[PDB]
């Protein structure tokens, strides 16, 4: 309904108005949680020739540990260089629906099992026809998402996926000179 | 309405997977037609401190005067410099709302009513609290706007701004290359 609608035209607003990123995303995420449930949100960026993903924001219920505390790490061979090209949302159990998962090559994902985290939600973003980066949510508990559920994080998320790549020019402008 | 979400959706859409920026505006604008009965649109870009507006973005129905056909232009001592604080939409007039109408410090007012345009509305582009452009429409009929109407275009006045911002950044960087 209208739910969806509003919470679009408040981040619209949002973005328009609030000056520090930081600030924005705070709240922008505590709205999406009026739409969606999750415990815990991060926006990654993708770096995909260097095979790269950085920590762009977080709002995290957990702490992981520090080694797995970098804002920047490879990607190579990963899960989640897999989804590059994803064009709709994905929702997925750690545990099951992750060919990865184990402490070997999926340390994150284990360590995130290992923590209690149990659910973990993709939501690709875009710009130019680039996937610039992710929405995530990481839960306890296997959230249920339907169809309509994601398709109204999608649209949500190309909200994001503006808000995202405005602070990703700011900085390329930045350190252009 | 669902008409309306989808709307927002799809230019979050356009915007996240349309690499050119000319068939970016011409796609958003089109589908704007379908909420919104207007003749033409137009997106300016503003210069606060030269106290300039550049057009970025055109799809008139009609011809202008040689004489007002230019890129860049002042807009010092015009009706448009007292919106350049503005949150929200504003529908008007053009011969009744406007003080600046008929005097010669208004020929671009002057020439849309000539060309039989009664209506126009401002809508503000907006990117951390700071107005860099307007979205605005002309029609001959002078239609009601509702408070959800202008809510819309604002909400989705809102990613066109970063849009816009984002192509002035690129610019901007392919100029420092």
Same mark, same amino acid.
């Given at each position: 309904?209208?739910?969806?609608?509003?919470?679009?035209?408040?981040?619209?607003?949002?973005?328009?108005?609030?000056?520090?990123?930081?600030?924005?995303?705070?709240?922008?995420?505590?709205?999406?949680?009026?739409?969606?449930?999750?415990?815990?949100?991060?926006?990654?960026?993708?770096?995909?020739?260097?095979?790269?993903?950085?920590?762009?924001?977080?709002?995290?219920?957990?702490?992981?540990?520090?080694?797995?505390?970098?804002?920047?790490?490879?990607?190579? =061979?990963?899960?989640?260089? =897999?989804?590059?090209?994803?064009?709709?949302?994905?929702?997925?159990?750690?545990?099951?629906?992750?060919?990865?998962?184990?402490?070997?090559?999926?340390?994150?994902?284990?360590?995130?099992?290992?923590?209690?985290?149990?659910?973990?939600?993709?939501?690709?973003?875009?710009?130019? =026809?680039?996937?610039?980066?992710?929405?995530?949510?990481?839960?306890?508990?296997?959230?249920?998402?339907?169809?309509?559920?994601?398709?109204?994080?999608?649209?949500?998320?190309?909200?994001?996926?503006?808000?995202?790549?405005?602070?990703?020019?700011?900085?390329?402008?930045?350190?252009?000179?």
């Amino acid at each position: 309904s209208n739910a969806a609608l509003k919470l679009m035209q408040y981040i619209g607003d949002a973005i328009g108005t609030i000056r520090d990123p930081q600030e924005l995303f705070r709240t922008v995420t505590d709205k999406l949680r009026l739409l969606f449930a999750f415990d815990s949100a991060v926006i990654i960026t993708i770096d995909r020739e260097r095979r790269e993903a950085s920590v762009f924001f977080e709002m995290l219920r957990f702490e992981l540990p520090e080694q797995l505390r970098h804002q920047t790490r490879s990607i190579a =061979g990963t899960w989640l260089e =897999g989804h590059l090209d994803d064009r709709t949302v994905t929702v997925a159990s750690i545990a099951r629906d992750i060919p990865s998962f184990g402490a070997d090559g999926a340390p994150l994902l284990w360590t995130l099992h290992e923590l209690g985290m149990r659910q973990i939600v993709l939501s690709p973003l875009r710009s130019g =026809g680039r996937v610039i980066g992710f929405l995530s949510f990481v839960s306890a508990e296997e959230k249920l998402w339907s169809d309509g559920d994601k398709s109204l994080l999608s649209g949500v998320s190309s909200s994001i996926a503006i808000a995202v790549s405005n602070a990703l020019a700011y900085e390329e402008l930045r350190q252009r000179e």
